[PDB]
Design a protein around this ligand. Structure first.
Ligand code: HEM
Ligand code: HEM
Lengths: 379, 397
């Protein structure tokens, strides 16, 4: 570990670096990572790589805050302290967290879920019908990015005419245009309430807080869910025999989808801040210190998962942390599973041959594990 | 009752002086109800007269640049922004005094001359390249570069990084075909962005090897890294954008007042007074917001703690009860107690750099050119926080 820098993104440019985390779990499940030139804020942090300790942190939001602690003015849930800590749901603590979380969940109505599902079915079929068998194409740009972006446009109530602002955002100007458009959409919901999540929250927060919420959702669909779809396809391509088994029996799909989420772990790390002295993994943490947990590593901890380094679509049980755990548990878990189920039903219905014909290209990040391009041939 | 000061259509053609004449006459201090265009869906007190504007600016305890009442955060634009309290212009005492003094300590005589020497050579070179009589866009070709270079020099940005940085940090952007600007943001997607990474590496370098520039002084509560990034951005919006806009706006005013143009260029002793009239007339930063920290009466209106107050220096600067012939450009105007650079504890820290940029630019321009024709209608930045020209196509002879 002394020679390993978990903040050096050159180590994450080719996928989540599982080999480094095998060393981390073996050598020191919890340890103090000194800051390097690559470390946000030039400040060290406790790094947590094993499942039991990761789960312990996630399950104690009072000790391990998503806002701040000690003398630290602001924190949040990435390693860089952010002044928007305390102002968006995933960087909030009780009592305001419980209130806003319930308001957000009140927007995920059965009719909204049906609206998303109906659209998803129609679109997945259209896209898969358009595939030319045997002809290489970039599955990320043409399919994996498209479906969940449309899902979040429905949840947020973005009209077809205006969806390009969102696509274009996935340059500083692109970001400013997304921001400006989001503020216009939010004011529009205030003027004319609608039956969607943004309206629910806007009409219950400042516009700035509503933007943070908008972007949280936009990112969850446009990036995290896209990453699970692309990585699920890559995993199945790398395991053709399981692809065949799953194609032969879609009743296997729910268990397979949990294994895709464990395997891909698209959101592989989270930061918290200690609010008081506490011990974790037998080490003493002081109020104010940063704690980073690595669900991407926890999800391959062999203390918890048998043959943890193997993809197995029949895996049971499968208590993965890919959607988090505790009071901030992912509010979109069933929507993500829905996206994966519909896509793989439709894809595996038509194709039982998936070949990746160029090396996968990955996003360079230790906060997201994602594939930027994945050229495949489907037969 | 039919005017919406938050509808940017009213600002799309320049600052709407006619609307603010109405505002000063009918109600110097006015509760503006929220419309579809109003940030946060929340009303605010609107202040259009000079005296009442100063009552607000001169009382930073009652009219906070951070927040007030029960409001979680406020700041100095109409929209509530979470960077309130984290960037110098949106700080109150006691922190404001300490950071303003610190930033100010970076403005050494040495730095001023460094800026002046570079500005002189650049302005001379650009104006030397002008083909007399040939139309060109003054904003893009001359006015835009100079203050961006000034900021790079204050911040100690290496010359070799400036081409890249200019494209990245440019405060303006196009949206639906109009130019806009924003205040610096630091939301989740901005964390470890390319500009965040660049800025904090630049800061790391100056912590390892302190340099003779303002970013080194400030980087060596003190400003957290997040706050240093917001400060880096602040100088490009607060300093480079406004100064560019005063330059383009000053050229337009001179073009529209050919007799003033002749008087000025035939006696440069008048420059100092001319430059203050340019700032008054153009008022590049025409509005500010504050938040009331207690119940208070202003212009006979009962403001409550937590409520938003917007002052319009752009309107105050043409208040005919303080400026004679307020609606006329007069390069000899004296006295000229304009509010273009603010007033009180937040008075512009860069005012003398702005005056320097305007001085050098106009010495170089007017000594060469006595004829300035605007050959198309000016296009304006769509904003009520910045008054500025997007394009100004001119012929110089
Ligand atoms: C495979 C796709 C996804 C994965 C892997 C994922 C993962 C996660 C994780 C790990 C958290 C916990 C954050 C923490 O502990 O700090 C979370 C929270 C959250 N997720 Fe997701 N997510 C996914 C898709 C979605 C979607 C489609 C939505 C749309 C509703 C969504 C909405 C949210 C929200 C609103 C939170 C904040 C909950 C809270 O802080 O109370 N996610 N997600
Ligand atoms: C014509 C050009 C400029 C104009 C019209 C202008 C205008 C203003 C105004 C009206 C304020 C008051 C803010 C408030 O009351 O809330 C201000 C503050 C400030 N300005 Fe300028 N400015 C110009 C150029 C510059 C330059 C060139 C710099 C730096 C190089 C600069 C840096 C600042 C800073 C740091 C503050 C905040 C000071 C504080 O809060 O203590 N400005 N400016």
């Amino acid at each position: 570990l002394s020679g390993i820098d978990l903040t050096d993104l050159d180590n994450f440019a080719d996928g989540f670096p599982h080999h480094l985390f095998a060393i981390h779990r073996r050598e020191a499940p919890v340890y103090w990572h000194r800051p390097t030139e690559h470390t946000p804020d030039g400040e060290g942090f406790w790094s947590v790589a094993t499942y039991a300790e990761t789960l312990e942190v996630l399950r104690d939001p009072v000790t391990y805050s998503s806002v701040t602690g000690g003398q630290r003015r602001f924190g949040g849930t990435v390693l860089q302290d952010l002044p928007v800590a305390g102002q968006v749901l995933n960087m909030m603590d009780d009592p305001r967290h419980t209130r806003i979380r319930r308001l957000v969940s009140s927007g995920l109505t059965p009719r909204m879920i049906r609206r998303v599902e109906d659209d998803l079915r129609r679109r997945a079929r259209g896209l898969l019908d358009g595939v030319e068998p045997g002809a290489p194409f970039d599955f990320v740009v043409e399919i994996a990015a498209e479906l969940p972006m449309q899902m979040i446009c429905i949840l947020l109530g973005v009209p077809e005419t205006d969806r390009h602002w969102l696509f274009e955002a996935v340059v500083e100007d692109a970001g400013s245009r997304l921001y400006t458009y989001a503020l216009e959409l939010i004011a529009g919901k205030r003027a004319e309430p609608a039956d969607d999540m943004l309206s629910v929250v806007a009409n219950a927060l400042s516009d700035a807080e509503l933007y943070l919420f908008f972007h949280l959702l936009f990112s969850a669909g446009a990036e995290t869910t896209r990453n699970s779809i692309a990585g699920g396809l890559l995993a199945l391509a790398e395991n053709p025999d399981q692809l065949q088994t799953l194609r032969s029996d879609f009743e296997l799909l729910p268990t397979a989808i949990e294994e895709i989420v464990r395997w891909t772990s698209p959101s592989p790390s989270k930061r918290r801040t200690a609010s008081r002295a506490v011990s974790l993994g037998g080490q003493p943490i002081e109020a104010g210190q940063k704690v980073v947990v690595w669900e991407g590593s926890a999800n391959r901890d062999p203390s918890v998962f048998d043959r943890a380094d193997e993809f197995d679509i029949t895996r049971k049980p499968n208590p993965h942390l890919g959607f988090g755990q505790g009071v901030h548990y992912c509010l979109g878990a069933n929507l993500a599973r829905l996206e994966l189920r519909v896509l793989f039903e439709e894809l595996l219905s038509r194709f039982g041959s998936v070949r990746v014909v160029e090396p996968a290209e990955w996003t360079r990040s230790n906060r997201h594990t994602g594939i930027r391009h994945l050229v495949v041939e489907l037969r």
